């Protein structure tokens, strides 16, 4: 997350931290995700497409630090890793960048709600907030595009939804942005998601309720002028989410 502020998991209690285990070596952070029901985390396919092997991923909920424990956190294995069959990224855009992780603890349990662990509501079908409204993003991604290091503490910032008409201008992204995506950025291009934030949530108030409007997907650099963050538009994937979580 470029700009914004350090936060606690209490303020983003749906946030899932996803790591990869390397047999014979290290554990590395991969991506964020969002708890949509006790047993299901939603993330981005491009986080996993190169190595779609459920056994080597680890999911935490209630976790606000990258390399230490948070009181009340839960650690999960991935019982099922579901990627979108029409994911592609032959050009700049990532299409259908959405994934599901069924989570199961060592003792065989799903997530247990608390002050630090909570589901986030899905939007109603095709229901998005209006352009020019504020949304929150969160993650353990880079603080500057060219950093080698990552923040130790979870961050969040606020970005604004940008119209497709604006985002599809040639000097923005042209036809790379589709109606299955949403653009969001800072009016002054000072804050954005960045590498390490994919899979995490774009959270907007909708029908009285914090709602998973988007999933962090892609962009040209991070916080660059006329290059918004691009987010999977969740309200266009409800049937996919419903049929794969059954």
């Amino acid at each position: 997350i470029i700009g914004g502020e350090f936060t606690t998991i209490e303020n983003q209690p749906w946030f899932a931290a996803i790591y990869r285990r390397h047999r014979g070596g290290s554990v590395t952070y991969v991506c964020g995700g969002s708890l949509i029901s006790p047993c299901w985390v939603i993330s981005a396919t491009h986080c996993f497409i190169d190595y779609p092997k459920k056994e080597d991923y680890i999911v935490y909920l209630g976790r606000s630090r990258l390399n230490s424990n948070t009181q009340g956190e839960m650690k999960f294995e991935v019982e099922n890793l579901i990627l979108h069959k029409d994911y592609s990224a032959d050009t700049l855009a990532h299409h259908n960048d959405i994934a599901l992780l069924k989570i199961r603890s060592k003792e065989g349990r799903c997530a247990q709600p608390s002050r630090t662990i909570q589901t986030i509501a899905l939007p109603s079908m095709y229901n998005d907030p209006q352009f020019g409204t504020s949304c929150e993003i969160t993650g353990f991604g880079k603080e500057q595009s060219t950093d080698y290091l990552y923040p130790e503490q979870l961050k969040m910032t606020v970005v604004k939804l940008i119209s497709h008409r604006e985002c599809q201008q040639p000097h923005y992204y042209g036809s790379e942005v589709t109606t299955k995506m949403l653009c969001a950025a800072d009016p002054q291009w000072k804050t954005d998601s960045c590498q390490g934030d994919s899979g995490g949530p774009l959270v907007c108030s909708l029908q009285g309720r914090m709602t998973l409007t988007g999933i962090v997907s892609w962009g040209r650099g991070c916080a660059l002028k006329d290059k918004p963050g691009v987010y999977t538009r969740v309200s266009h994937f409800l049937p996919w989410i419903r049929s794969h979580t059954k």
Epitope: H22, T28, A93, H94, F140, S198, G219, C222
Partner: nanobody
Framework: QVQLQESGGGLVQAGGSLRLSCAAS????????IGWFRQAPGKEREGVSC????????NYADSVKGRFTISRDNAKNTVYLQMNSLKSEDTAVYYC????????????????????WGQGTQVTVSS
């Protein structure tokens, strides 16, 4: 503790062959896109070759295409650069790199990338 380490460099005669190795530790390079770069005296760094995460495709810079081959051995957790028909202009420090945006992989995805570099191996081709 992810790292890469190059080996195999040295002095070779023009027209000859050389194989460089890039050995990973702390991770397995089998599911990451890997590449080789080089930097010759007084010149900027140049991409040489890369292999995709799946291993289904490889790419070559104009200056080495048709002469160099990149490959990956998952049993040895090592990537190779086979350099045939060497020329004096191939004299450089060679570096391998794993999981960087744009290196045989997307440059727009916002997942975390390892962005690992090796330390270099010197290749000198005498004509």
């Amino acid at each position: 503790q992810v790292q890469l380490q190059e080996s195999g460099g040295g002095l070779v005669q023009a027209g000859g062959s050389l194989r460089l190795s890039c050995a990973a530790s702390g991770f397995t390079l089998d599911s990451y896109a890997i590449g080789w770069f080089r930097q010759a005296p007084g010149k900027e760094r140049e991409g040489v070759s890369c292999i995709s995460a799946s291993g289904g495709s490889t790419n070559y810079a104009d200056s080495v295409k048709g002469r160099f081959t990149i490959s990956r051995d998952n049993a040895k957790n090592t990537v190779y650069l086979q350099m045939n028909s060497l020329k004096s202009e191939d004299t450089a420090v060679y570096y391998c790199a794993a999981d960087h945006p744009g290196l045989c992989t997307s440059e727009s995805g916002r997942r975390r990338y390892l962005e690992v570099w090796g330390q270099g191996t010197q290749v000198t081709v005498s004509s």
